[PDB]
Paper text:
Recognition of N-linked glycan at residue N276 (glycan276) at the periphery of the CD4-binding site (CD4bs) on the HIV-envelope trimer is a formidable challenge for many CD4bs-directed antibodies. The glycan at residue N276 (glycan276), in particular, has been found to restrict antibody access to the CD4bs, an important site of vulnerability targeted by many broadly neutralizing antibodies isolated from chronically HIV-infected patients. Cryo-electron microscopy (cryo-EM) structures of these two antibodies and 179NC75, a previously identified glycan276-dependent CD4bs antibody, in complex with HIV-envelope trimer reveal substantially different modes of glycan276 recognition. Despite these differences, binding of glycan276-dependent antibodies maintains a glycan276 conformation similar to that observed in the absence of glycan276-binding antibodies.
Numbering used by the authors:
A (entry chain F), C (entry chain B), D (entry chain J): 521 to 548, 567 to 664
B (entry chain E), E (entry chain I): 32 to 134, 138, 151 to 152, 154 to 185, 185A, 186 to 321, 325 to 355, 357 to 400, ...
F (entry chain A): 151 to 152, 154 to 185, 185A, 186 to 195
């Protein structure tokens, strides 16, 4: 399985996932390289951590292909799942979706991972 | 049919970054205290294998000009120079009365008083200097010269054990960042590259000390290559990389030697012991260059129409810039590039002398002079010229004679040389898509 | 959703959770301020990774509102759930409860997130 | 429970787990020790984060005792579960198993934690 | 009967580690400025309690030799010296004309010209030196000496407030790395140790500088202990640690004092003010040592078979190495160890004089001399001797009389003295196993 | 009053010439070197 490969269409691209995920975390007295290594690792650590924090409040850090009943909002794009997995492609797809991403990166943290025990309240308490 | 928000983790999405970058190479010895200016193994030797991979169909817009790496390297390498020189001597016990004499031209023969290993005894001591090491103290008198820095700057000499020899550094990106490589030679650093790849760490990039001519950086294919921020800005830099190399073997033809003199008790200055005395020289034969340039001109005509074109000398500006200039061993050259750029390029059916300098003002900084160690050797360079910092004439002078001079307008551009092929990116693993589901 | 807001009674306070969770991880030559930044980021990261490590051995780093059947020990405060969610409040609640917590921050790591596969032994093996 | 304890047979060794997990993460101007601590904490954080990433792509960061239906390949040591949990011991186990481990440390990231929503496709899409 | 891959997380699996390690101690005052070279609270006081636990049944191979920690600590201590000396004075004006006189032997009485607090006025200023501080400038003349460094190196005087006094340091392993402790005295550093434990941070090592004789190191039990990389390499080090303590109380018998002179305005040099004058000496009464060595020889014969054995003096090499040498308080000793190693050990039915020095070349570095402060005191050492850096003779004298000399063979080995018991390791929490399951 | 007008010898950029150089000082910049004499002050540090 390769790194990158966004020109494979989004489903075929998802034949690979976790090897790109390793790349998020490892590359697979002092001189400047000593302090710059130390700064570098921390920025990567923080970043790796920031996306795990997203995979907390979005859920799915325990199941790295994610599910919610959050609305797909028809203001984003009506493009078909058929187009998306088999003809569309991740960079070109983000270059369509980025105009909405900041909306979703909040709206995704609806109750299913943001609040849902407040609803389990009715399931388990009188 | 209906839909929900869903996420795939770690799918390929990326954007440019101010991200920091760090070194790798082969290990030369694994001694943490090695003789080296770029990487005393305090640069971690992250895998010497370039584990690069195809970006088939991955259309990435490149940008050689808004790239972060130029500024980063410029800062990093200036940091390295200071971190190599701080361990070694500063030369506050050297700006002083110099007495000099003339000998077989402008390698001035000289002596001075200084402190010895003891902070009492004056020692009379002796050295060669190339004339461009010095200026007169106040007036035209034999006793009255000072080193060229002392007017406004302090000098510092690296141990000859801090070689400037250009060992390549590979810039790794930190994880969650990556390098995209334009996987073509038939490309210039702005807009699309249609064929591409990615690597965690750049293939070898030579630190390439260079000042006007790109030394040591690799060649193209299909055509000679031109790169610029904006070619219509005649003032700002134009870069060339050739399809063919030319090799240059410059020499100090003078048998000249380390004279170690103690200047304070832990401090060792390298004065310059002598052997006839001749000007520094560079054997390159004209016609290979001449007909290579005839194709450089033809590549350039694609931007301008059917001009007769001239390459002409750099002139008038500071000699530190206006000569071509580079290291051999640990000792620096400043060559009258005119002899290689005084040349004409019709459309129809169509070797240097040099000055050495023991002092340099590298990166055009205030303060922080380097008195380069005069090398124990008849120094020999054995190296490739492969590209040009051209400047096209600002005088627009159109439709007759449009023309160029070599320049050194930013040493950032002496690195742009190879950097053009690398785009440094963050990966964002945040793959929102429509799908549909219910939680497990 | 606000940050802090602890004077919201504990259930109503849980109308907010994840915006505080973001505040745990992101703010929403060497030199002095650079070494201070580096040290600061590491202390926040290492402290952030401690609570994610707790949400390992406590479970629930996935489901960020947490379940176990670990006993609420009647030696702790007997305050009613009704008081807790709808009149009582977080800083004040921890300032009541901390005297018990060094029990709980270990007794929490019972079988559900410490030993339960030793019980899956009886579910899946003969 | 203790730290270490590898000489307890692997099942009885698993009477301890989570306390060793804490030990993975905390011990339970420049200045020379200061930069060394800063490097040390980063290496520990990143190495701890490297095993959380393993517990991502292997699954089971949400459940620190782990399941997959990935094949136990009979090319590995044939030693019995009874021997392993009740006579064999973790160092002495890994020092028999390391020769296989690199295969497992990739083959473990099969579809269950590497691809499975591509199969939930059949469960939830027409 | 089917099986699947399963994983248990955090199970104890570990391997040798090229990992970094960091300091802890008790807090001496919490003050960041508490006077010390080793651990002035810049070393974080991570838990002073050794919260160790039994590695019951945990069989492990120890490796005193391919251990990281020796090189780590050695690099570390040298860095501590630098980043305790940079805070105080470089003595860059001190190599100068020294005049000297001879007084009741080898404590030379001397005066010199120097800068005052003003970079104009000479001041005549006065100090004692031990002879081994100086060398003649060129000729046998009363005015003509330099400090022993100046020939190749620059000196740095540390504030008396950088006390070299050996406060112990505990190395913590950072988390996900751990320390294994061989939990027996009946052990040598290579192969299995049957009984064992783990520690997050080591029992204080005791970084007394130590040159040939292990000062301050813990005792053994059951037998005397002997350790080496390979005993068939006669030339490379042999370490002894004793089953019985020994104690030494060396003294400067001379009432000698700080004289403080400003050599530049920020720069207090500590000259040495005098009171009859006697050679520095030690008291260790012979017979305790003698019958200890009789058992040391027996433990050595348990390698070699029934030889008569001699311990003989270090000779010919650098006085810095060939004496046993250590600090007391903040001033340094170089003792003619011959009187404690000029002795004979049959099979059948079977006090030092010393030189003080102000300059030291510690760790045998080029450059970076330390001029130790002359301590104000009739200085008293009060310390244990507990082990020996032996060497066995290159005389492979064919089964007759094989013998030993003490030595300063590596200051790494002056730390191996305690590091032998500690093995630093990575925990890998990656417990792949067969069992059965299905996902929840 | 209390703004003294002063001169001293020093090195230049050359480590040889005692350049005579001139500066004002507010009085609290200085102390007498040893005695109440016009040539005899040092900087207060
Ligand atoms: C890029 O520019 C570099 C200089 O800026 C060129 O690198 C080297 O530059 C030095 C100094 O000018 C040259 O001079 C010396 O060369 C010897 C060579 O020793 C090695 O080769 C012999 C056999 O030929 C072998 O017996 C030895 O064991 C070594 O393997 C060195 O000993 C000196 O230290 C010093 O380097 C070099 O000749 C020159 N080339 C190399 C490869 O060292 C470099 O050639 C330029 N590269 C390009 C592509 O243009
Ligand atoms: C290990 O080697 C060390 C030297 O490398 C030995 O450490 C100390 O070395 C110094 C200088 O030689 C000795 O001299 C002075 O001791 C006094 C002690 O004051 C304390 O004790 C008195 C009562 O006796 C009490 O009144 C005081 O209030 C203090 O509580 C210090 O004040 C001086 O600064 C200076 O250190 C030490 O005697 C000596 N030992 C100690 C414990 O300082 C060390 O003895 C060697 N240890 C072993 C086990 O061999
Ligand atoms: C200009 O270069 C000359 C030649 O290197 C320097 O002159 C003198 O060089 C000789 C070494 O060749 C020095 O020592 C003398 O050598 C001869 C043999 O060559 C020997 O017969 C003598 O007994 C003596 O050892 C001599 O010291 C040196 N002269 C000076 C002024 O030091 C000359 O130093 C260079 N010019 C300047 C301004 O330094
Ligand atoms: C090293 O130091 C000595 C002194 O220790 C220097 O000697 C001086 O040399 C000059 C000629 O160069 C002598 O002549 C006088 O020079 C002044 C200033 O240019 C001029 O105004 C006078 O008319 C006269 O010509 C001078 O007397 C002599 N001594 C002193 C105390 O200055 C020597 O030149 C130095 N050599 C080097 C190579 O640095
Ligand atoms: C090779 O280099 C050229 C630039 O040297 C790269 O693309 C070209 O970029 C320039 C400046 O952004 C564009 O020129 C401008 O176009 C507008 C619209 O026609 C015109 O009004 C302006 O006066 C100016 O000329 C140019 O359109 C653009 N495109 C092309 C196809 O040249 C190019 O991406 C690089 N190509 C390769 C294969 O490396
Ligand atoms: C740079 O461009 C200039 C101008 O086009 C070239 O200058 C001319 O070069 C020729 C030789 O190629 C010179 O001729 C020689 O003149 C001497 C003196 O009369 C004579 O003895 C020789 O037999 C020969 O004829 C000519 O003087 C010179 N003219 C000018 C105006 O400079 C030059 O060749 C180009 N290249 C370089 C490296 O300068
Ligand atoms: C300057 O030219 C010389 C040839 O004269 C180049 O080679 C060096 O020549 C010197 C003598 O001038 C050699 O020294 C002698 O070497 C032999 C054997 O090692 C020894 O028996 C003699 O006692 C004496 O030491 C020297 O070895 C030789 N090589 C080098 C590297 O110095 C020299 O390369 C030219 N100078 C420079 C600075 O390159
Ligand atoms: C370290 O390993 C030893 C064994 O090498 C443990 O000692 C004893 O190990 C046996 C393993 O069979 C434990 O089971 C006992 O077996 C005997 C027959 O061998 C049986 O008669 C007993 O009824 C029992 O089934 C035994 O409990 C255990 N005994 C103890 C506690 O010493 C030792 O426990 C292990 N130590 C550690 C890691 O603490
Ligand atoms: C060799 O050691 C002697 C003795 O310490 C140094 O000679 C002189 O020592 C006296 C202190 O006894 C210094 O001060 C004088 O003391 C007497 C009373 O003893 C007093 O009557 C005088 O008014 C004065 O205060 C004296 O300054 C010192 N001499 C020097 C040259 O400083 C001697 O310095 C040592 N030798 C060398 C070469 O330094
Ligand atoms: C401190 O500095 C003063 C000068 O400021 C030194 O005085 C000098 O002392 C020597 C005797 O030791 C005087 O005699 C002459 O010495 C030279 C060189 O050895 C010799 O060739 C002559 O025949 C004669 O003996 C010398 O005149 C005198 N003054 C100067 C300006 O050198 C003093 O020795 C220094 N004292 C210390 C403690 O460093
Ligand atoms: C005490 O120290 C010894 C080494 O001094 C540790 O084990 C021994 O290690 C040596 C070198 O690896 C082995 O010696 C070699 O054995 C072969 C085969 O007999 C022989 O051909 C060679 O000439 C050489 O002697 C030695 O076998 C090995 N075993 C023993 C029992 O010494 C030992 O682990 C340490 N033991 C303790 C209790 O500290
Ligand atoms: C050198 O021997 C002396 C004994 O003579 C050791 O003790 C120190 O003795 C001096 C006088 O020789 C004492 O100074 C006097 O102390 C009294 C009482 O505090 C004070 O009123 C006087 O004005 C005068 O200063 C001194 O206190 C005493 N202790 C020390 C630490 O100096 C001395 O230990 C021996 N020298 C060294 C450096 O150890
Ligand atoms: C810069 O340095 C020069 C010396 O290189 C200074 O010249 C000296 O100035 C003093 C008066 O200040 C002259 O008078 C003599 O002073 C001594 C010492 O107190 C006294 O004993 C005599 O009776 C006499 O009054 C002295 O002749 C003169 N020259 C020398 C060689 O000392 C100059 O004043 C300094 N200037 C500044 C602005 O620092
Ligand atoms: C790159 O994209 C091309 C299209 O750009 C992929 O090319 C083909 O796309 C068709 C779609 O009908 C596929 O059926 C072919 O299978 C694809 N080409 C082949 C032969 O694979 C191309 O594969 C993608 N490049 C990669 C990622 O290899
Ligand atoms: C030029 O050098 C010669 C020696 O080569 C010397 O005699 C003469 O004085 C020098 N003249 C000048 C002005 O430097
Ligand atoms: C440099 O350029 C000028 C014209 O600007 C020309 O006169 C001169 O001959 C050229 N060469 C040199 C070495 O100055
Ligand atoms: C705090 O409680 C009061 C009840 O008097 C309420 O009105 C106020 O809005 C609450 N503030 C919050 C939500 O923190
Ligand atoms: C030795 O020192 C005495 C003073 O103690 C002095 O008189 C004599 O000249 C000195 N002799 C030598 C050769 O140093
Ligand atoms: C040291 O060893 C030599 C023999 O190498 C011997 O002659 C000498 O007496 C010994 N002792 C001293 C104090 O030098």
């Amino acid at each position: 399985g390769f790194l990158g490969a966004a020109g494979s269409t989004m489903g075929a691209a998802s034949n690979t996932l976790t090897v790109q995920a390793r790349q998020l975390l490892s590359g697979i007295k002092l001189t400047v390289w000593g302090i710059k290594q130390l700064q570098a690792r921390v920025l990567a650590v923080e970043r790796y951590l920031e996306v795990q924090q997203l995979l907390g409040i979005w859920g799915c850090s325990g199941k790295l292909i994610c599910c919610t009943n959050v609305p797909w909002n028809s203001s984003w794009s009506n493009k078909s799942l058929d187009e998306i997995w088999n003809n569309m492609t991740w960079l070109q797809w983000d270059k369509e979706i980025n105009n909405y991403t900041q909306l979703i990166y909040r709206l995704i943290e609806e109750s299913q991972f943001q609040q849902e025990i407040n609803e389990v309240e009715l399931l388990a308490l009188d | 049919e209906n839909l929900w928000v869903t996420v795939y983790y770690g799918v390929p999405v990326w954007r440019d970054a101010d991200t920091t970058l760090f070194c790798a190479s082969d290990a030369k010895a694994y001694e943490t205290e090695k003789h080296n200016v770029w990487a005393t193994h305090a640069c971690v030797p992250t895998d010497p294998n370039p584990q690069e991979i195809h970006l088939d169909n991955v259309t990435e817009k490149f940008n050689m000009w808004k790239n972060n790496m130029v500024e980063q390297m410029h800062t990093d390498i200036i940091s390295l120079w200071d971190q190599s020189l701080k361990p070694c001597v500063k030369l506050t016990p050297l700006c002083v009365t110099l007495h000099c004499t003339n000998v077989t031209e402008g390698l001035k023969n000289c002596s001075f008083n200084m402190t010895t290993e003891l902070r009492d005894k004056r020692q009379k001591v002796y050295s060669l200097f190339y004339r461009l090491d010095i200026v007169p103290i106040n007036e035209n008198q034999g006793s009255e010269y000072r080193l060229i820095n002392c007017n406004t700057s302090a000098c510092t000499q690296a141990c000859p054990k801090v070689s400037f020899e250009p060992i390549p550094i590979h810039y790794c990106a930190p994880a969650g960042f990556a390098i995209l490589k334009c996987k073509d030679e038939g490309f210039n650093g702005t807009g699309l590259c249609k064929n591409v790849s990615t690597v965690q760490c750049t293939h070898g990039i030579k630190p390439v000390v260079s000042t006007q001519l790109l030394l040591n950086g690799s060649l193209a294919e299909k055509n000679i290559t031109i790169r610029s921020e904006n070619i219509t800005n005649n003032a700002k830099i134009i870069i060339v990389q050739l399809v063919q190399p030319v090799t240059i073997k410059c020499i100090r033809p003078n048998n000249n030697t380390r004279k170690s003199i103690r200047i304070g008790p832990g401090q060792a200055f390298y004065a310059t012991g002598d052997i006839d005395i001749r000007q520094a020289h560079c054997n390159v034969s004209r016609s290979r260059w001449n007909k290579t340039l005839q194709e450089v001109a033809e590549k350039l005509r694609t931007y301008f129409g059917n001009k007769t074109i001239i390459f002409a000398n750099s002139s008038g500006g500071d000699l530190e810039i206006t000569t071509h200039s580079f290291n051999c061993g640990g000792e620096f050259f400043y060559c009258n590039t005119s002899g290689l750029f005084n040349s004409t390029w019709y459309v129809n059916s169509t070797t240097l002398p040099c000055r050495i300098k023991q002092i340099i003002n590298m990166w055009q900084r205030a303060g922080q002079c380097m008195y380069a160690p005069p090398i124990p050797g008849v120094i020999k360079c054995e190296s490739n010229i492969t590209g040009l910092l051209l400047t096209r004439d600002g005088g627009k002078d159109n439709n007759v004679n449009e023309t160029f001079r070599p320049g050194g307008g930013d040493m950032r551009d002496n690195w742009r040389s190879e950097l053009y092929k690398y785009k440094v990116v963050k990966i964002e693993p945040l793959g929102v898509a429509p799908t549909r589901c219910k939680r497990r």
